[PDB]
A paper describes a structure:
Severe fever with thrombocytopenia syndrome (SFTS) is an emerging tick-borne zoonotic disease caused by a bunyavirus, SFTS virus (SFTSV). The genome of SFTSV is comprised of three L, M, and S gene segments, and the M segment encodes a membrane protein precursor that undergoes proteolytic maturation to produce two glycoproteins: Gn (the N-terminus) and Gc (the C-terminus) embedded in the viral envelope. It has been shown previously that Gn plays a major role in binding to host receptors, and a number of effective neutralizing epitopes targeting Gn have been identified. To elucidate the molecular properties of SD4, SD22, and SD12 binding to the SFTSV Gn, we prepared protein complexes of SD4 Fab, SD22 Fab, and SD12 Fab with the Gn head and determined their structures using X-ray crystallography.
The structures of the SD4-Gn, SD22-Gn, and SD12-Gn complexes were determined at 3.3 Å, 2.8 Å, and 2.4 Å, respectively. The buried surface areas (BSA) of Gn in complex with SD4 and SD22 were 893.4 Å2 and 891.7 Å2, respectively, which were slightly greater than that of SD12 (853.5 Å2). Specifically, SD4 and SD22 formed eight hydrogen bonds with Gn and its associated glycan, whereas SD12 formed 11 hydrogen bonds. Interestingly, SD4 L-E55 and SD22 L-Q55 formed a hydrogen bond with the N-linked glycan residue N33 of Gn, an interaction not observed in SD12. However, SD4 and SD22 H-Y102 formed stronger hydrophobic interactions with P168 and the hydrophobic atom of Q73 and R74 side chains when compared with SD12 H-V103, potentially accounting for the higher binding affinity of SD4 and SD22. The remaining amino acids at the SD4-Gn interaction interface were highly conserved: 99.9%–100% at H31, S32, R74, S160, S163, S164, L166, P168, R171, and G264, which suggested the binding sites were extremely conserved among the prevalent SFTSV strains. We observed that when three SD4 molecules bound to Gn within a hexon, they occupied much of the central region of the hexon, concealing more than half of the accessible Gn regions. This binding left only a small portion of the Gn exposed, specifically at the valley between two adjacent protomers (see also Fig. S11C through F), potentially preventing Gn interaction with host cell receptors. Of note, antibody SD4 exhibited the strongest neutralizing activity, with an IC50 of 1.0 ng/mL for MC16 and 0.02 ng/mL for the NB24 strain. Herein, we show that a single dose of SD4 at 20 mg/kg animal weight could provide 100%, 80%, and 20% protection for the mice in the 4, 5, and 6 dpi groups.
Numbering used by the authors:
A (entry chain L): 1 to 211
B (entry chain A): 21 to 341
C (entry chain H): 2 to 133, 143 to 223
Write the structure that this text describes.
Amino acid sequence: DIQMTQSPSSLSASVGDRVTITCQASQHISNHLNWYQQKPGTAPTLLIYEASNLETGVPSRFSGSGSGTDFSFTISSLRPEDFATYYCQQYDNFPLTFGPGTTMDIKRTVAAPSVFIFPPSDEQLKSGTASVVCLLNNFYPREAKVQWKVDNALQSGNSQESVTEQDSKDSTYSLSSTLTLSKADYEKHKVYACEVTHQGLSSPVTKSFNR
Amino acid sequence: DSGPIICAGPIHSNKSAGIPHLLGYSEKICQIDRLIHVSSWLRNHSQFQGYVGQRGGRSQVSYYPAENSYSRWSGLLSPCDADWLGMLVVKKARESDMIVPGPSYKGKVFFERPTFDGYVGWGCGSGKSRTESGELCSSDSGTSSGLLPSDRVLWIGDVACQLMTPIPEETFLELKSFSQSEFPDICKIDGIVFNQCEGESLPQPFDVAWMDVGHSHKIIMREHKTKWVQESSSKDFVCYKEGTGPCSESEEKACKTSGSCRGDMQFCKVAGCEHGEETSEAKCRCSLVHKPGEVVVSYGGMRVRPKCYGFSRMMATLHHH
Amino acid sequence: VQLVESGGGVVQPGRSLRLSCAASGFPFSGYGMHWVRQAPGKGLEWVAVISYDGSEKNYADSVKGRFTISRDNSKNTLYLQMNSLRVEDTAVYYCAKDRDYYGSGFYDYWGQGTLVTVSSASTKGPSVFPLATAALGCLVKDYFPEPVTVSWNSGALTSGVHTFPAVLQSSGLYSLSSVVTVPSSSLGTQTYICNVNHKPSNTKVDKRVEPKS
Ligand SMILES: *[C@@H]1O[C@H](CO)[C@@H](O[C@@H]2O[C@H](CO)[C@@H](O[C@@H]3O[C@H](CO)[C@@H](O)[C@H](O)[C@@H]3O)[C@H](O)[C@H]2NC(C)=O)[C@H](O)[C@H]1NC(C)=O
Ligand SMILES: *[C@@H]1O[C@H](CO)[C@@H](O[C@@H]2O[C@H](CO)[C@@H](O)[C@H](O)[C@H]2NC(C)=O)[C@H](O)[C@H]1NC(C)=O
């Protein structure tokens, strides 16, 4: 019924700076918007209810405002705990709808990844499947993507990527892009290249191997 | 079901929030549409925490007799509604004040009864609700939230309250007599000596028509005649912003003195509307309230605009023979 | 206050499951009760609500006809019968108390969540494969269901370990990667072993890693 849209999708600010989240609406919600914090792996926790009130235990750094359609949730002095995903929620009309979430992430100096590539084992290549793995290590910011190539042929949709959480020390992320082929297809080809683009590399990166 | 006069059922957030003293006939009517007046009474008198009427509002108040005609006319005002509007008082119950049989007092937090001398209410408090008899409040965990459903509110009788056209005392006495002439068996109604008896029976239910002419006791009636006249007074109009909600004293007075404000057909006919200006904007719109009009009763030979009128239950004592 | 869920587990499309949110510390019969679910990787989606005495129920869509919510105020538990389960319903399920009487939508206290996966897959233990400052790792492939736990050298090696969030595959079997960075001068000077542990299928594997020609 009521679509609740948040913005920005993801922040990237460091400790001590001031954050602002924005949550809009498709109808007049009045003062009926709650706010939620959800740390990774934990359960969501209510921070602000009725767009101004602070639930018991919520520090005074967290603030809220807004009346009608547009709201805001303002953290004044970011602390390492306050880095989590944040959601808004209306209760003006059931069904109760949520926002799409804002993922507060920490910020540091730009870091280029350290790309490694792994040819498949032989223990795996007797089941009929070969899995090539390209590893991106300790880079910031999170935004970067890999592109597999089999003999200079851009592969499409036969790979899968995973990203670690932001490191508690490096403030960097890591990526694991796995390219999967059949053994009958793996033995058909020669060069298995992994091309890496990132904000910290003035030229595109490649790590390959001839099997 | 009935219909919100100006404000939808309230969705409160904390039991510990204030009950503000708004100043506009509108702002108040909003507080009535959202059972704030009852909530206050419960708190003030009966030492209660929170709000009653969550999500429902005045539209969902439980009534006895449940087949309450006036309930549909949202504009028609209960005894409690008019307390907030200053027209009368609903009094904290005393031991004397008799609780009538019939109503489903159970889990109820508030129940109101028109009495022969006035209007009385019986409020429970924190985390308690009335027993199956109305006589005692008892712990009810389902009342621990302080944000309670409207069904926990019982208004008894098909009462309609309005602004009296003041009558002289001679008329009241003439009316007093005629009732006694009509009801010559009753001795005491709700505790007030109606006809001299000396031989009273024990108190007993009594369902009668009645009006508050504005004097000591209500006048009870057997053969009455009621005409509902429409009068299109300012009080027959409420002013709202679609959005913000109720309008404030000045805004209302302005609207009800300017014409400019948006309004429904009748409001235009009466006081003036004005259009061709609103581009995006928003201004207070005023609308007629939904009601048969103002009632005028006919009894004893005499035509009276009573404060309140209705058919309710009033414990009473008949003669002995 | 403490809401605590229980009941989740693997289930295949068509089957049904029952959840339970047992309560302590607070007057369970004075408050409405919720169900909120989180799809793996996605945001929050409210499922169902129930009122103080268990009469007025408002479910979301996407569950109407498939989900029945209930409660027993005598033993302070919250039920949720999920029939006609589909793949779209794989999510982590939470129960939440509400400040009001009916479930108006304030989720003050949340439970610690339980996980329900809906897919037709069987139960299969992982196939662990090695991956040769230098980098090496272990390929935990083709298992079902989650979770998995990967240590390294029986919990000794911790610095530089990255256990990647697993990825569902078209076959429905999960597969993750765990990697470590070693100081190049480890060939012979150090031995590395990854300890995979898939408790839901009792599969515990310890794969060694070595130079290769
Ligand atoms: C419960 O108790 C509160 C507190 O006494 C009541 O609020 C009071 O309501 C009366 C209603 O007439 C207010 O009187 C009016 O005040 C305004 C100025 O605020 C004045 O212009 C009017 O002529 C009139 O005197 C009063 O101010 C307000 N507050 C206080 C502190 O008395 C409330 O009405 C009570 N509710 C029930 C159901 O008993
Ligand atoms: C309503 O507001 C009140 C006042 O801020 C809250 O009351 C207490 O808050 C303290 C912490 O500041 C808690 O230790 C108490 O337990 C609270 N009282 C109660 C009765 O819970 C209260 O929490 C607010 N209402 C809700 C539902 O959170």
